Amino acid sequence: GNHWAVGHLM
């Protein structure tokens, strides 16, 4: 996965 962008999928 990616470090950031952890506030969209979940």
From Swiss-Prot:
Positions carrying Methionine amide: M10
Transmembrane portions of the chain: none
Task of the protein: Induces an itch response through activation of receptors present on mast cells, triggering mast cell degranulation.
Name this polypeptide is given: Neuromedin-C
Organism: Homo sapiens (Human)
Gene expressing this chain: GRP
Interval of the full protein contained in this chain: 41 to 50 of 148
